[PDB]
Amino acid sequence: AAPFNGTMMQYFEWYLPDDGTLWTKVANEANNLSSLGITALWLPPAYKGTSRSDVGYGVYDLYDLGEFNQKGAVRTKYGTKAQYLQAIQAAHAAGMQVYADVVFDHKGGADGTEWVDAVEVNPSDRNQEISGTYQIQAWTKFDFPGRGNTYSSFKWRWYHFDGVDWDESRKLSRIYKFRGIGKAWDWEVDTENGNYDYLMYADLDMDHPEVVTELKSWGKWYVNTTNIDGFRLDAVKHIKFSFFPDWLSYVRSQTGKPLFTVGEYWSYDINKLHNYIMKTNGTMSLFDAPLHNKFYTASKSGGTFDMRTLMTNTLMKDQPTLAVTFVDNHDTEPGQALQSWVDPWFKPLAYAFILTRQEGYPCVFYGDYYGIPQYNIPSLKSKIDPLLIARRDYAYGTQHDYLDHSDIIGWTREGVTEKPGSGLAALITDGPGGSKWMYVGKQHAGKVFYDLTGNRSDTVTINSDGWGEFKVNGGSVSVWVPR
Ligand SMILES: [Ca+2]
Ligand SMILES: [Ca+2]
Ligand SMILES: [Ca+2]
Ligand code: NA
């Protein structure tokens, strides 16, 4: 048939104002985004957090999609339940898929405390206990006073969690592990800090049968209510590895939907990512964090970065079909947790790289597209749109790589017969400009190519052999496509 590349978009950024307008914006922008070739949207957590202003990762109630009066308000930072459903309707009507953010690591905003026997563990080695057992007052009682028993009568208590990091009685910060039959940090998880199961708030015990059943019930309920098309999994390295293949297979079989899933395993070590994929049987894709670090490193190297090494040890290279590529996200933003913002000059080159190459499933960042007023970061829509059109109409077929110079690197796509007019030749450089002969295909012999980005006004004519001498300006990008 006539193919169309897949392109995802993270539709949110950290510093959005708490005005309950995001769901409305999704409904309003759906067709515009759709026409550019965006095929799926990753939406932020839609359920009630610790307060109305919570970005969503301080999850309080998974069944409150901005519908009940809990935590100071009815709506979430993004809007109400009815608005969320309308957003999903608009996206589907425009032909796009919707991925929902899933936060299963912890739970915060407890309604009350409970006295629990606990032991302190070494922050740098959670496997080592550093105190005797003693009673603490932990925030583990979840009753959901605003919701009651609507949708689910499940009440959370201390035994559904593995530990917390605050004793309300003595007002102390310690990593507390709960005592009890079968109580222990989950495994397997990331080994940093000995065992990185515990992260923040009340840590979920993935070994507790009732917790597993409850999350499986929520999954089915969520999909059957919203009709979402996939998931974005939060903090997977802090969650028992074997839990997800189990949860996913259940939800997929019960709903009958394929449910594409991408998990966030934050690590620049490609080995840990390989291990995770192996341990989960390729049941989900992962964000290519290592590639983000590459982009970031190159942007700060003032041209000295060796472009020939750009793909080395990245998921895009090792597991192209399970890699979700990106330039920046809500965590890499200035002032954030994993801040490592790619400099503006390099940003368009990075987008050309992930949007026109065949490896990976690219994700465009809301912050980059619409700008981030918080830090006077402008909208790059003018630079990104031409690249979106490139992916939509031209980036198809056999690829030829030219990662053979410390500055200027390129690649071509021959195009496909089922997509007339397709074919492309891209060049990017982190230093001075120049030219490079590249093979686009004998089938394009005699055709004239032009720079879709608009950066260059000259044209390139393909010789009888299918080769062209493409050009690029210094510290820039040029995407050549047939007239
Ligand atoms: Ca446990
Ligand atoms: Ca955990
Ligand atoms: Ca260089
Ligand atoms: Na746990």
Swiss-Prot record:
A GO-annotated cellular component: extracellular region
Can you tell me which residues bind Ca(2+) 2? D162, A184, D186, D205
Cofactor(s) annotated in UniProt: Ca(2+); Na(+)
Keywords on record: Calcium, Carbohydrate metabolism, Glycosidase, Hydrolase, Metal-binding, Secreted, Signal
Q: What is its EC number?
A: 3.2.1.1
Sequence positions that bind Ca(2+) 1 = D105, D197, D203, H238
Alphabetized CDD domains for the sequence = AmyAc_bac_fung_AmyA (cd11318)
Chain positions recorded as Na(+) binding sites: D162, D186, D197, D203, L204
> Where does the chain bind Ca(2+) 3?
G303, F305, S406, D407, D430
The active site of this protein is located at: D234, E264
Q: Where in the cell is it found?
A: Secreted
Q: InterPro entries, from UniProt?
A: A-amylase_thermo (IPR013776), Alpha-amylase_C_pro (IPR015237), Glyco_hydro_13_cat_dom (IPR006047), Glyco_hydro_b (IPR013780), Glycoside_hydrolase_SF (IPR017853)
Write out the catalysed reaction. Endohydrolysis of (1->4)-alpha-D-glucosidic linkages in polysaccharides containing three or more (1->4)-alpha-linked D-glucose units
Q: Does the keyword Chloroplast apply?
A: no
> Which molecular-function annotations from GO does this UniProt entry contain?
alpha-amylase activity; calcium ion binding
PANTHER family found in the cross-reference section: ALPHA-AMYLASE
Q: What is this protein called?
A: Alpha-amylase
